Amino acid sequence: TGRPEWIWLALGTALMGLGTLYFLVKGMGVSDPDAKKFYAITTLVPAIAFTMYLSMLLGYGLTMVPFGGEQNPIYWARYADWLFTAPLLLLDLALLVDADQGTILALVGAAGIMIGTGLVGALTKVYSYRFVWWAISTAAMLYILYVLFFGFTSKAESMRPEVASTFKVLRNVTVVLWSAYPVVWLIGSEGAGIVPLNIETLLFMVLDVSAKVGFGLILLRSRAIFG
Numbered sequence: 281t282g283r284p285e286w287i288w289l290a291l292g293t294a295l296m297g298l299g300t301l302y303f304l305v306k307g308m309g310v311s312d313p314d315a316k317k318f319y320a321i322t323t324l325v326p327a328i329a330f331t332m333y334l335s336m337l338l339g340y341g342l343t344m345v346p347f348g349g350e351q352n353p354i355y356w357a358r359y360a361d362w363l364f365t366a367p368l369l370l371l372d373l374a375l376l377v378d379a380d381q382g383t384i385l386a387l388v389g390a391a392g393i394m395i396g397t398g399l400v401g402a403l404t405k406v407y408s409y410r411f412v413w414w415a416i417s418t419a420a421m422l423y424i425l426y427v428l429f430f431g432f433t434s435k436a437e438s439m440r441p442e443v444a445s446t447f448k449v450l451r452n453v454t455v456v457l458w459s460a461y462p463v464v465w466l467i468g469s470e471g472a473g474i475v476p477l478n479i480e481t482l483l484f485m486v487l488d489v490s491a492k493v494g495f496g497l498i499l500l501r502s503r504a505i506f507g
């Protein structure tokens with residue numbers, strides 16, 4: 281096939297794999313229970329992304345959805361990725377500020393809706409309705425971000441400055457990166473079809489890698505992960 285976006289798929293696979301091994305090696309060396317917890321979660325994130333990026337590279341997770349009078353290429357493998365990686369990243373932040381189970385349940389649930397409606401919209405055949413689902417998915421993300429910024433930040437204040445300061449960084453990187461996904465979707469192949477798939481793939485890999493490996497490097501190198 282040799283699609284124009286394969287090189288970015290290959291780069292995403294490479295970066296996710298390397299980040300996975302590094303976390304794995306670093307994680308199985310630590311003896312602290314709590315640290316192990318964070319390491320197990322943070323290592324699984326890029327591991328899942330690696331498998332999906334590899335699959336897409338190999339030609340899977342791609343489907344032609346008709347709308348706008350075209351046969352549009354929609355990489356659904358991404359949602360198979362985010363469905364598990366998104367909530368896991370949320371869990372890392374939750375464990376960091378000692379969030380409550382109710383909060384975590386609510387966040388993971390909102391994340392489920394976000395990815396769920398997102399995929400449904402990316403698969404919808406009625407052009408205008410694709411944006412209705414997109415809208416609902418974004419509303420769910422805003423809820424998540426609101427909770428992360430107003431709820432979590434507040435409880436991170438009961439933690440030590442080192443833990444609070446580590447969370448602020450992860451929170452910030454998360455808010456900035458996550459906020460970009462809906463925009464890319466809107467102007468990309470799933471939406472207006474303004475930005476070509478090759479470039480679109482480039483944008484998503486940069487966001488995915490930064491939100492997983494970048495997020496992990498920051499979290500796993502901090503002393504805030506220790507019990």
Ligand SMILES: *C/C=C(C)/C=C/C=C(C)/C=C/C1=C(C)CCCC1(C)C
Pocket residue numbers: 329362365366369394395398399414417418419421457458459461462465487488491492
């Ligand atoms: C490693 C992957 C991460 C951190 C992915 C985060 C993804 C989002 C915040 C995705 C959001 C979306 C919307 C707000 C609406 C349209 C569809 C999505 C799923 C692209």
